[PDB]
Design a protein around this motif. Structure first.
Motif, PDB file in Angstrom:
ATOM      1  N   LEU A  38      -0.968  -0.733   3.028  1.00 53.76           N
ATOM      2  CA  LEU A  38      -1.972  -0.048   2.348  1.00 53.76           C
ATOM      3  C   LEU A  38      -1.261   0.232   0.763  1.00 53.76           C
ATOM      4  N   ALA A  39      -2.383   0.378  -0.219  1.00 55.37           N
ATOM      5  CA  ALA A  39      -1.619   0.310  -1.635  1.00 55.37           C
ATOM      6  C   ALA A  39      -2.223   1.525  -1.876  1.00 55.37           C
ATOM      7  N   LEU A  66      -7.285   7.053  -9.050  1.00 54.27           N
ATOM      8  CA  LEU A  66      -7.550   6.841  -7.961  1.00 54.27           C
ATOM      9  C   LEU A  66      -7.279   5.066  -7.410  1.00 54.27           C
ATOM     10  N   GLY A  67      -6.051   3.747  -7.176  1.00 49.66           N
ATOM     11  CA  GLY A  67      -6.205   2.342  -6.749  1.00 49.66           C
ATOM     12  C   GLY A  67      -6.042   2.330  -5.774  1.00 49.66           C
ATOM     13  N   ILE A  68      -6.481   1.740  -4.796  1.00 50.18           N
ATOM     14  CA  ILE A  68      -6.461   1.735  -3.010  1.00 50.18           C
ATOM     15  C   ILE A  68      -6.812   0.682  -3.497  1.00 50.18           C
ATOM     16  N   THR A 124      -0.837  -3.260  -9.369  1.00 50.90           N
ATOM     17  CA  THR A 124      -1.842  -3.460  -9.002  1.00 50.90           C
ATOM     18  C   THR A 124      -1.630  -3.101  -7.208  1.00 50.90           C
ATOM     19  N   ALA A 125      -2.905  -2.278  -7.020  1.00 50.13           N
ATOM     20  CA  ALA A 125      -2.695  -2.118  -5.692  1.00 50.13           C
ATOM     21  C   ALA A 125      -2.760  -3.650  -4.590  1.00 50.13           C
ATOM     22  N   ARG A 126      -3.700  -3.924  -5.207  1.00 51.82           N
ATOM     23  CA  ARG A 126      -3.633  -5.723  -5.027  1.00 51.82           C
ATOM     24  C   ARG A 126      -2.610  -5.966  -4.273  1.00 51.82           C
ATOM     25  N   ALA A 127      -1.516  -6.257  -5.452  1.00 51.10           N
ATOM     26  CA  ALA A 127      -0.404  -7.023  -5.855  1.00 51.10           C
ATOM     27  C   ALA A 127      -0.060  -6.441  -5.084  1.00 51.10           C
ATOM     28  N   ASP A 175       2.094   5.125  -3.285  1.00 47.40           N
ATOM     29  CA  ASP A 175       2.728   5.293  -2.053  1.00 47.40           C
ATOM     30  C   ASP A 175       2.270   3.721  -1.350  1.00 47.40           C
ATOM     31  N   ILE A 176       3.159   2.927  -1.254  1.00 54.84           N
ATOM     32  CA  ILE A 176       2.767   1.725  -0.481  1.00 54.84           C
ATOM     33  C   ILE A 176       3.286   1.913   0.816  1.00 54.84           C
TER      34      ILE A 176
END
Ligand SMILES: *C(=O)[C@@H](NC(=O)/C(=N\OC)c1csc(N)n1)[C@@H]1N=C(C(=O)O)C(=C)CS1
Ligand SMILES: CC(=O)c1ccc2cc(N(C)C)ccc2c1
Length: 254
Positions: free
Chosen positions: A224-225, A14-16, A147-150, A210-211
Motif C-alpha cells: 500500500l502507498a 490523496l494518492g492511493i 506516484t502511489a503506483r510506482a 506512508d508506504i
C-alpha cells in the motif's frame, strides 16, 4: 466515493495504490498522480544500498561531522564522536527517519543520480531522485516525486520479489516492521495483530505519506502507498487522513 470524502474532510489531495499480492486485486485513487515522496524514498535507498554492499560491508564505520547534521538528526546527532556503521545508519534512516543518516547513505551509494540509475534498473521509470534532502520550492515540478503506483511497485520489488537476496530482504523488512514513526498512519488503519512494515514521510504543503507492506495472519501480503498533500506551503497535516484512507483500502480488499 470514500476517498473523495476524505479529501473533502481533511482539505487535502490523496494518492492511493494498494495491491493484494495473493489475488492481484488492487485499490486505486489518483494512483499515477505525482506527490513529493519525502522520506518514503529512504526505504528504496536502503533497498539500493543492500543491492550494492555485502551484509559484512554494512559494518564499515562512516565518520561525519556536525556539518553533516541537518534539520532532523535524532540518532546521528548522538554519534558525531564515533561515527556510525552503514548498518546503524540504515537503522536510523528507516526506523527514526533520521535525515542525516539518509544523506550519509546516499553519499555512499553515489548520490541521487546513482539512486535514480538503480531505480530505473528495477523497472521504476517514475520515481525521480534529484537532490539530497528532497527542499520546499513549488508544487508541479517532477523532481523528488513519485506516484502511489510506482512506490508500491518499487517497494514490492525490493522487499518481496527478487531484487534482493533473501538475507538482505530480511534486513529491510525487519527495519521497516520496527519503524517508530508510523503508529498513527497505516498501522492505525490495519486490523490488530496484523504485522506491518512501513516508512513515513512528511513535507510542507501538508505532505504526509506512508508506504507499507501489511501481512494478514495467514496469506499473502498487501502493499500500500498512501500519499497526500495540501495547497498551502504552511499547511500542516493530519495523520488521521492516512489511517482512515487505510481503513477504506482494507474494507475494499477484505
Ligand atoms: C521525511 O519525510 C523527512 N521530512 C523532511 O525532512 C521534510 N521534508 O522533506 C522533503 C520536512 C520536515 S518538516 C517540513 N515542513 N518538511 C523526515 N520525516 C518525517 C517522517 O515522519 O518520516 C518527519 C515527520 C519529518 S523529518
Ligand atoms: C535537510 C535539508 O537540507 C532541508 C532543507 C530545507 C528545508 C526546508 C523546510 N521547510 C521550508 C519547511 C523543511 C526542511 C528542510 C530540510
Amino acid at each position: 466515493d470514500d476517498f473523495a470524502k476524505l479529501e473533502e474532510q481533511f482539505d487535502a489531495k490523496l494518492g492511493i495504490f494498494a495491491l493484494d499480492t495473493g489475488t492481484n486485486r488492487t485499490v486505486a485513487y489518483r494512483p499515477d498522480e505525482r506527490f513529493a515522496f519525502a522520506s518514503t524514498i529512504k526505504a528504496l535507498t536502503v533497498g539500493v544500498l543492500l543491492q550494492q554492499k555485502s551484509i559484512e560491508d554494512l559494518n564499515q564505520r562512516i565518520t561525519y561531522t556536525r556539518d553533516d547534521l541537518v534539520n532532523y538528526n535524532p540518532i546521528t546527532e548522538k554519534h558525531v564522536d564515533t561515527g556510525m556503521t552503514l548498518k546503524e545508519l540504515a537503522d536510523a534512516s528507516l526506523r527514526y527517519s533520521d535525515n542525516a543518516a539518509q544523506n550519509l547513505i546516499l553519499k555512499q551509494i553515489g548520490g541521487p543520480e546513482s539512486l535514480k540509475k538503480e531505480l530505473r534498473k528495477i523497472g521504476d521509470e517514475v520515481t525521480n531522485p534529484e537532490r539530497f534532502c528532497p527542499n520546499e520550492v513549488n508544487p508541479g515540478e517532477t523532481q523528488d516525486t513519485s506516484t502511489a503506483r510506482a512506490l508500491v511497485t518499487s517497494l514490492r520489488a525490493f522487499a518481496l520479489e527478487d531484487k534482493l537476496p533473501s538475507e538482505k530482504r530480511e534486513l529491510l523488512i525487519d527495519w521497516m516492521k520496527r519503524n517508530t514513526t508510523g503508529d498513527a498512519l497505516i498501522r492505525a488503519g490495519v486490523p490488530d495483530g496484523w504485522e506491518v512494515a512501513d516508512k513515513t514521510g512528511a513535507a510542507s504543503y501538508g505532505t504526509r505519506n506512508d508506504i507499507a507492506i501489511i501481512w494478514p495472519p495467514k496469506g499473502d501480503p498487501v502493499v500500500l502507498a498512501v500519499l497526500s498533500s495540501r495547497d498551502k506551503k504552511d499547511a500542516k497535516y493530519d495523520d488521521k487522513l492516512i489511517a482512515e484512507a487505510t481503513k477504506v483500502v482494507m474494507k475494499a480488499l477484505n
